[PDB]
Amino acid sequence: MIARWFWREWRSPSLLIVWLALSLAVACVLALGNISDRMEKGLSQQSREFMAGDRALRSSREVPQAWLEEAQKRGLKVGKQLTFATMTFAGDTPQLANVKAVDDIYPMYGDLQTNPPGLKPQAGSVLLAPRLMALLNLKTGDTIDVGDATLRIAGEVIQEPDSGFNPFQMAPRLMMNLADVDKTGAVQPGSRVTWRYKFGGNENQLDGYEKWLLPQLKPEQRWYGLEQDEGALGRSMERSQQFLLLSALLTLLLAVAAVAVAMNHYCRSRYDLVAILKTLGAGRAQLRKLIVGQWLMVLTLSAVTGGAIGLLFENVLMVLLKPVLPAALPPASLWPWLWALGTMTVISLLVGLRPYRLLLATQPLRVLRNDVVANVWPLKFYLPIVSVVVVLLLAGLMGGSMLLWAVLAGAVVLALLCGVLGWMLLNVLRRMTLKSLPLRLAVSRLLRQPWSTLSQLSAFSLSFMLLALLLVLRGDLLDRWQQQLPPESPNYFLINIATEQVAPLKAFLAEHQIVPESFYPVVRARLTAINDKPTEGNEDEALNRELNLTWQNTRPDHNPIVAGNWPPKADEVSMEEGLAKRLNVALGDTVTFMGDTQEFRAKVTSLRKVDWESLRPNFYFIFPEGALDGQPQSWLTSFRWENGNGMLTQLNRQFPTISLLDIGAILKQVGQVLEQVSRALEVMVVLVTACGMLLLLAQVQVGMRQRHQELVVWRTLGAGKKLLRTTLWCEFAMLGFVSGLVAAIGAETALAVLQAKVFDFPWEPDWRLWIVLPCSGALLLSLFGGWLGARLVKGKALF
Amino acid sequence: ENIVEVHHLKKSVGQGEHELSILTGVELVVKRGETIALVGESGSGKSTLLAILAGLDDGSSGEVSLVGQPLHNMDEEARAKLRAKHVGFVFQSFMLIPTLNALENVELPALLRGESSAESRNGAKALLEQLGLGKRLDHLPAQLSGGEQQRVALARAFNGRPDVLFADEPTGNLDRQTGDKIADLLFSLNREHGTTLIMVTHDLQLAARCDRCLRLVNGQLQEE
Amino acid sequence: ENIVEVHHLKKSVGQGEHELSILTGVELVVKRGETIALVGESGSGKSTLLAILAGLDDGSSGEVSLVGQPLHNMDEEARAKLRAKHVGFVFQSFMLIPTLNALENVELPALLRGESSAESRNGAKALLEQLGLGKRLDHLPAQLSGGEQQRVALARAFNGRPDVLFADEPTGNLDRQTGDKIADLLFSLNREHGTTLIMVTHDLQLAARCDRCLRLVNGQLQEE
């Protein structure tokens, strides 16, 4: 009996859409939370065995061997790492790459993933990232030249236990051992080296060694543990988690709106049904049991199907995101399933308790009077409680994350503004004459149904925000690269030059038709104290890295100076405006730097607005000329070239020590990374636009009765079947069309604000987006309208 | 035993000036086995009086005794259980379950009473065969004819054989031949069941079919 | 001129033994400008042959010709365009488009005729002015009253200057005062318009006001 009831009732369009909307909600939340938990489990197990221990020491210089011997005699395993940046040979094609020196002890925890597996860095052997092999057209078993040596390719680097999560990486990975590091001879003192020493063993010995070595820590050496290794990687992973949580929150909010409207309409339809039940003697207890059982059954069925499709999406995501994700990941836990089930059940309850009580308390008089409705729980009291519980739930999800609250509020306000702008566009379209009867009738129908149309336009506007932002990032970054030829604007960077090498390369610049651009004498030093207050502890990106310093006789070309005076004198330094604002640094302040040789001092005497977002040489501190002679004066410069690469090859052969950086190569690499994350985000956009499609189906389902009787009126009056079908076609096509124009306007405003305030590039209108996006929206909506018209008009039951 | 007793039932709708006192005192005693038909102009509160008769709502004042209980005193739960126990319904739009087959629609009251499925379905199929719907047992209501749907609703009413049967405009959406068939089949099936029935309709001959006909005139009942 | 011609019109519904002939042979001749009322008991299928004369569907048999076009001899689209070109309609609910205001409600059939927007607006506002509704032209149909809604529907019918008007119990939701005032209003407006009328009404005084009255009995037309 009840089985037949459920099976036949499940075919009802409103209940069916409610089930599928909950299925999509649980699917998206399960997939996103599952990916987040896989990330978190990966990072936790890695922090277990990235470290391969508990206490690690990082430095810009090789620490004394006495400390390592003390660790060894303390019954502790010592792991050696040395990160560096150099060049590799694709035959006669140089290419920048990041090398890492590791001893045979590593990996003493976790597992190393190579192609072939079970490889280690031996003498004469190097392991390389697969992307580099794709770029360097080399294969496993070949011999590649690095620095001043040629070592055989042992195998690929699938994933390393000490290889982090840096999607925006500038160089590939070159696993190789310390002995070969000394053998190459390309390693130079004071270069961009970083020694990372891990210590493993039992907790007490590690703590004792840490306490013993604490007084012997230079400012260039940081001691960290399992969770204390949070520099830029921690910020990147937290931002990724926040982004995925944002996407999940948006799509689940859309699902909440969809289920709200659909199931409210469903209960409105079933008012008469439940009234008939009550009249026939259905007690409150029996009716309560029946309705709660039906709700629980649909909840469970939706949960199961959503879990299945969410597993499918998780597999799709893990197949798609291979370039920016570790190849091997920890298995999913059962916690995301609990996340999904709890979220879906709580949203279902908080959206359905009012319809549940309406149905439970529906007046049986509705059998006799089709208008009498049980007036219980008025909105004036229902809305405050649901609003407060929703905001409390969002806080409990987030806590004190002000940034994501602000971004979510901005997104919602943007959706509302898109809705109101679309309504204004509809009104102005009506106010100009329409020769076509279908168009005028459709726009009148859109305007005189305000709440439905505004909600629908907002939903599609948000989905098309996402899709348009995707097309923006991809195509507009391509065009931005085409737009990446502004005046001056150095292209190729040259870092880590010794003083004696300055003259020949300049002659090289003087000989290969190259204009010598700005020549920055740069020293790498870490800020230790501002106004004698130690900066160790603050989570600023600049503090937790080697700050670059330079001195120029004349004022920088790209960098305007706002406050202070130029040039600063001895012990007087110019300060970047942005960092001074973010680090409460004013004129006359005191800054202390731990250099490679000596700790030096400076007084903040001038403020300059350095556009770090502009592709120009950017430095927070500019010292006076001849101020850091005691330090090893490294060098930096830049130049512009656009014809061939043989000059790069010959310059690299002339100077294997110098560090070269191609803006074009790194730009292309970040471009393909953006393309991969773009495929991920288009999967997300497919999901969210499916949710918006559900909202559309529901919002038209609540209008089935009114719309159907409208078509009846038109048929009686004399409107043709073809006329009505074209009316629906043009209606939905133009709704999608105006949604597309709204999305185009939002995207254009985004580009304008990014290119006027952030990137200061001249703005051009991307006609490609304006001709592709709204047309696609119109085509999809017109396909939907055609199906709907076939279901409504083609049927002869109109009379 | 007076199955239905009415004592000065006053009913008013609205507040202040627009408080439409539709009913200003009703006195009616219905003996068991009686055929009473309520008539009057449409919208004159005949539906309201019908609803208050079966205890669907409460009136401004008065005494209603259905099977000798004080309807003004019990809650909605007691009214519902009493309706299931002794009361059947027949509607102009016949309010059939849109998603259940005819056999299910006619066996539904028994399941609400919790009665065993076996004898309930035996009696249900027996009544449906008595209605000559042998080829429509599993048919959904949508693919049924108006007369067929009325027959299904009537069988649902007579499944439990209630003591009282509240019906309003049973022939509202059917022609004269189908209306006559449903009406005289109703009268037939009733006469061996000893069930008092209350019709709310404007048909003169249908009221004349009942042994007693009462007209509702400005809040009062008048014998005709 | 023979505005309406109907010969041996027959209409049937149902299947098998439950198949029923809604119309059992109807003949009818209606000239230009006549006021003809179709009387019949409730649910006698008046809507059925009203729609069949409208060209909304096809009857079982019978040569039916409207203003000289036998609707049974062309597609539905030609029937729809003939409807838009010549006939006007008045139903009981007035089906006033809630997503359109009164002025545009009157204007839209004139647009469907293919006429200019400006002339349609002029006719609509003029008719509303002579209907006393100039102060509520923008009012959405929800807040219009029953008599006002009737007036809006009548204006929608009469803007296109229809040669014939089919109306069916328009005052079914209205009281006697509104009923007879709108009755005389439409009778006038058509008599100065010179428009033929077909009237479906259970009330007999409307038929008495009409030039001719015809009773529908068992799908058969009888002169009254």
XYZ file of C-alpha atoms in Angstrom, chain A residues 112-389:
278
model
C 58.817 8.308 -2.273
C 56.861 8.231 -5.543
C 59.059 8.107 -8.649
C 58.726 6.767 -12.194
C 60.006 4.074 -11.986
C 59.293 3.708 -8.247
C 61.818 2.739 -5.612
C 64.528 5.152 -6.756
C 66.966 7.240 -4.734
C 69.406 10.010 -5.660
C 72.733 8.269 -6.233
C 76.026 9.580 -7.567
C 75.585 10.684 -11.161
C 71.799 10.231 -10.995
C 69.111 12.920 -11.039
C 65.330 12.709 -10.713
C 63.217 15.254 -12.564
C 59.625 16.441 -12.637
C 57.541 15.056 -15.530
C 56.576 18.566 -16.639
C 60.261 19.355 -17.142
C 60.678 16.226 -19.279
C 57.700 17.354 -21.346
C 59.375 20.751 -21.741
C 62.918 19.391 -22.162
C 61.913 16.540 -24.551
C 64.099 14.197 -22.469
C 63.250 10.700 -21.260
C 64.184 8.363 -18.430
C 67.675 6.914 -18.747
C 69.092 9.895 -20.647
C 71.851 12.195 -19.373
C 71.059 15.828 -18.563
C 73.496 18.636 -17.791
C 72.847 20.637 -14.620
C 75.106 23.496 -13.592
C 78.619 22.254 -14.366
C 77.997 18.491 -14.442
C 76.124 15.934 -16.542
C 74.172 13.264 -14.666
C 71.946 10.464 -15.918
C 68.164 10.677 -15.555
C 67.313 7.979 -13.012
C 63.575 8.510 -13.397
C 60.614 10.832 -13.100
C 59.365 12.580 -9.957
C 55.766 11.461 -9.493
C 55.448 12.891 -5.966
C 57.884 13.299 -3.141
C 57.455 12.969 0.628
C 59.269 16.326 0.876
C 57.600 17.941 -2.163
C 55.047 20.527 -1.088
C 51.781 21.825 -2.520
C 52.718 24.838 -4.673
C 50.455 25.085 -7.732
C 51.959 28.495 -8.549
C 55.448 27.042 -8.792
C 58.146 28.672 -10.900
C 60.560 25.760 -11.348
C 60.335 21.961 -11.567
C 61.859 19.566 -9.029
C 65.349 18.054 -9.327
C 65.892 15.427 -6.644
C 69.609 14.738 -6.263
C 72.139 14.071 -3.525
C 74.670 16.154 -1.609
C 77.726 14.358 -3.013
C 76.687 15.238 -6.561
C 75.995 18.790 -5.330
C 79.641 19.092 -4.342
C 80.654 17.288 -7.545
C 78.893 19.713 -9.912
C 80.777 22.764 -8.671
C 77.939 25.052 -9.780
C 76.972 25.782 -6.166
C 78.285 29.182 -5.115
C 78.613 30.658 -1.610
C 75.945 33.154 -0.629
C 73.688 31.922 -3.436
C 69.947 31.326 -3.086
C 70.499 28.181 -1.038
C 68.299 26.970 1.813
C 69.362 24.238 4.242
C 66.519 22.352 5.943
C 67.508 19.813 8.599
C 64.881 17.459 10.023
C 65.267 15.594 13.309
C 63.337 12.437 14.112
C 63.017 10.069 17.028
C 61.259 9.931 20.364
C 59.714 13.113 21.720
C 61.883 13.664 24.803
C 65.250 13.524 23.021
C 63.949 15.818 20.280
C 62.700 18.308 22.875
C 66.030 18.206 24.698
C 67.938 18.799 21.468
C 65.587 21.658 20.572
C 66.129 23.281 23.969
C 69.893 22.800 23.649
C 70.013 24.348 20.163
C 67.556 27.181 20.909
C 70.291 29.606 22.122
C 72.357 28.729 19.017
C 69.760 29.887 16.462
C 70.686 32.698 14.092
C 67.968 35.061 12.823
C 68.478 33.413 9.418
C 67.618 30.042 11.021
C 64.047 29.183 12.030
C 63.165 26.248 14.281
C 59.749 24.733 13.618
C 57.706 21.622 14.286
C 54.722 19.728 12.906
C 52.429 22.747 12.460
C 55.022 25.525 12.823
C 56.108 25.154 9.169
C 53.399 27.552 7.983
C 54.812 30.154 5.611
C 53.307 30.697 2.171
C 52.274 27.044 1.817
C 49.989 27.285 4.846
C 48.364 30.446 3.518
C 47.933 28.838 0.091
C 46.285 25.706 1.485
C 44.056 27.744 3.802
C 43.005 29.912 0.858
C 42.236 26.790 -1.177
C 40.111 25.414 1.662
C 38.305 28.744 1.984
C 37.677 28.875 -1.769
C 36.228 25.371 -1.919
C 34.089 26.078 1.150
C 32.861 29.246 -0.561
C 31.876 27.330 -3.687
C 30.113 24.657 -1.647
C 28.293 27.303 0.386
C 27.117 29.086 -2.760
C 25.820 25.942 -4.429
C 24.136 24.700 -1.262
C 22.466 28.094 -0.793
C 21.137 27.831 -4.335
C 19.909 24.328 -3.508
C 18.227 25.670 -0.363
C 16.369 28.269 -2.403
C 15.355 25.612 -4.929
C 14.042 23.179 -2.326
C 12.309 25.987 -0.449
C 10.282 27.133 -3.434
C 9.660 23.645 -4.833
C 8.540 22.028 -1.593
C 6.475 25.044 -0.569
C 4.628 24.665 -3.865
C 4.334 20.923 -3.251
C 2.763 21.440 0.165
C 0.448 24.061 -1.320
C -0.682 21.477 -3.868
C -1.106 18.803 -1.201
C -3.163 21.055 1.076
C -6.326 19.602 -0.440
C -4.952 16.056 -0.218
C -4.108 16.300 3.477
C -7.442 18.018 4.067
C -9.210 15.053 2.472
C -7.213 12.706 4.688
C -8.130 14.687 7.802
C -11.806 14.740 6.855
C -11.819 10.974 6.333
C -10.625 10.469 9.900
C -6.840 10.651 9.646
C -5.765 11.382 13.193
C -2.952 13.792 13.915
C -0.796 10.869 15.046
C -1.371 8.709 11.966
C -1.052 11.647 9.576
C 2.101 12.759 11.390
C 3.564 9.280 11.018
C 2.703 9.144 7.320
C 4.154 12.540 6.442
C 7.301 12.096 8.523
C 7.825 8.653 7.007
C 7.466 10.004 3.483
C 9.872 12.834 4.288
C 12.393 10.440 5.816
C 12.142 8.065 2.857
C 12.689 10.826 0.312
C 15.528 12.160 2.467
C 17.248 8.768 2.519
C 16.728 8.137 -1.194
C 18.070 11.585 -2.040
C 21.025 11.019 0.268
C 21.876 7.733 -1.446
C 21.633 9.057 -4.996
C 23.476 12.238 -4.058
C 26.226 10.182 -2.477
C 26.554 8.125 -5.645
C 26.723 11.139 -7.947
C 29.046 12.881 -5.492
C 31.388 9.911 -5.608
C 31.260 10.222 -9.388
C 32.103 13.932 -9.145
C 34.930 13.177 -6.718
C 36.418 10.689 -9.167
C 36.022 13.230 -11.977
C 37.721 15.943 -9.921
C 40.603 13.679 -8.941
C 41.099 12.646 -12.564
C 40.968 16.258 -13.733
C 43.117 17.993 -11.104
C 46.236 15.855 -11.568
C 48.610 18.707 -12.604
C 47.997 20.776 -9.454
C 47.477 17.901 -7.014
C 49.749 15.214 -5.572
C 49.443 12.004 -7.559
C 48.718 9.874 -4.478
C 46.274 11.037 -1.827
C 45.059 9.631 1.484
C 41.802 7.692 1.243
C 38.626 9.550 2.098
C 37.268 9.277 5.627
C 33.697 8.772 6.772
C 33.592 12.292 8.226
C 32.578 13.999 4.932
C 29.625 11.614 4.753
C 28.548 12.788 8.199
C 29.078 16.366 7.020
C 26.819 15.848 4.021
C 24.068 13.969 5.840
C 23.970 16.455 8.700
C 23.929 19.470 6.395
C 21.212 18.076 4.149
C 19.017 16.994 7.053
C 19.395 20.289 8.909
C 18.584 22.379 5.843
C 15.617 20.135 5.039
C 14.321 20.497 8.587
C 14.798 24.264 8.781
C 13.052 24.739 5.433
C 10.268 22.226 6.021
C 9.202 22.640 9.637
C 6.843 25.438 8.608
C 5.300 23.442 5.714
C 5.275 20.400 7.995
C 3.260 22.256 10.616
C 1.025 23.763 7.926
C 0.168 20.308 6.611
C -0.243 18.962 10.138
C -2.462 21.905 11.106
C -4.229 22.301 7.760
C -7.867 23.155 8.329
C -10.202 20.451 6.975
C -12.546 23.265 5.922
C -10.213 23.692 2.951
C -12.178 20.770 1.511
C -15.254 22.990 1.283
C -13.510 26.354 0.811
C -10.633 26.340 -1.659
C -9.456 29.681 -0.226
C -9.396 29.072 3.538
C -5.816 28.352 4.625
C -4.586 27.619 8.140
C -2.849 30.822 9.248
C -0.179 29.479 11.600
C 3.399 30.708 12.052
C 3.124 34.069 10.276
C 6.192 35.205 8.369
C 6.615 38.159 10.741
C 7.710 35.645 13.390
C 9.055 32.855 11.166
C 11.631 34.900 9.257
C 13.566 36.236 12.298
C 14.121 32.795 13.812
C 15.209 31.149 10.565
C 17.477 34.096 9.794
C 19.131 33.938 13.208
C 19.587 30.162 13.124
